[model samples]
Target: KIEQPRWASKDSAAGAASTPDEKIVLEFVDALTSNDAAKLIEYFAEDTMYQNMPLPPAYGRDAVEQTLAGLFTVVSVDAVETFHIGSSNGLVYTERVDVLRALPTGKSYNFSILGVFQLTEGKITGWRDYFDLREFEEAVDLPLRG
Candidate 1:
């Protein structure tokens, strides 16, 4: 079982200085865990695009907002943090882990996702996330074992 990392903190700062895009990434995760979709959407550009791990990219603000809304329906994000950050040009990369629990099942679920966000004028214009799909399903206790 993956226990919550005690070191995690909402005020936890990235070890090194962060670029503008990295700051948005941090704030975005904070909003996710806090269930502040309004604040989360504020960090995104009106033309923002999302490319989730294996899933196809969601284009535009409406699609991204809808996607995030659906996520909050099943599980509540409990804790989140950026473990690492890197940047190239206007794109920022983040490796983050989220401790979450499903409201229905009440089971603990930990998700480690790597995300890339492209920033323009302080707004997130594009996003791409990658993670282990199988691991997530197993952690959520899906595909019941016989």
Candidate 2:
């Protein structure tokens, strides 16, 4: 018996980045995959809210940057393999396998997540990623997936 966040959308799955909104969001994903915090921050507004739920939300761009910086210290980017993309009411959604290479060892893990992003005037105002914390814990431990 578990639950997903109330903020998550239930349906309206899209497959490709045809709309300009989806296209730029895809670019943002690219920046994440490249581990370019500088490029990634460019997509966010100064007051943007970000989170990797069920972790607490990080408010504002600088907070988000610090979170990313900490993440960068532990892992390097690989690729985000997307299963689908969706959009509704100005939010872009993606079901993705978030790949990361662990530091000093370079082993990789494929952690699946649903990412929800809100864009305003072409910059992200809010971003949240949803995934099971225990699953991630196991994913990191079992390098067998690597």
Candidate 3:
């Protein structure tokens, strides 16, 4: 288990928050990249909502856990680099790139992702990610959308 620091830089968005939302996001991403489902789920609220681009939102922590478990079986998260993070009104917005390796073909997909997190009492109550689905499909050589 990796112990993620509070913020990547002194100027990180969470630096202004009274709570540690930035720290929470950093730890969440660390668990995600490490494929530690247990650790990942620890950062969410019981009623958390998780959404990935091109898919309906998964409601609740169990739903998110199941979804991530399935995804981790098919893809390995090689790295995650956060470029920027901004926090306001209990929400944290982050811009980052994820390096993934598809298990089936051993192909690498490095894509930019924008993530928005809503925190309640230090745990994430809602999370959303935006990215190009087509780029991911091409990187993994999957079927094109009709």
lDDT of each: 0.72, 0.73, 0.76
* Model 2 clashes, total count: 0
**Candidate 1 lDDT, 97-136, residue by residue in tens:** 8777877787876678878889888888998988766645
Residue 38 in candidate 3, Cα distance off native in Å = 1.9
Give the worst 10-residue stretch by lDDT in candidate 1.
137-146
- Which pairs clash inside model 1? none
Give the TM-scores of the predictions, in the order they appear: 0.79, 0.79, 0.80
Model 3: worst 10 consecutive residues (lDDT sum): 1-10
* Model 1 spans with C-alpha error above 4 angstroms: 1-13, 135-146
Residue lDDT tens for model 3, 1-146: 12244545656543343347877786677567887677688888998899876676789999999877877777789888776677787788877778888988888877778899999888889999998776566554444333
Candidate 2 to truth, TM:
0.79
Q: What would the per-residue lDDT of candidate 2 be over residues 47-105, giving only the tens digit for each residue? A: 79988776677899999988777677667778766666778998998876677777767
Candidate 1 or 3, higher lDDT?
A: 3
Better of 2 and 3 by lDDT: 3
Error of 1 at 121 (Å): 0.6
For candidate 3, what is the total of clashing residue pairs?
Answer: 0
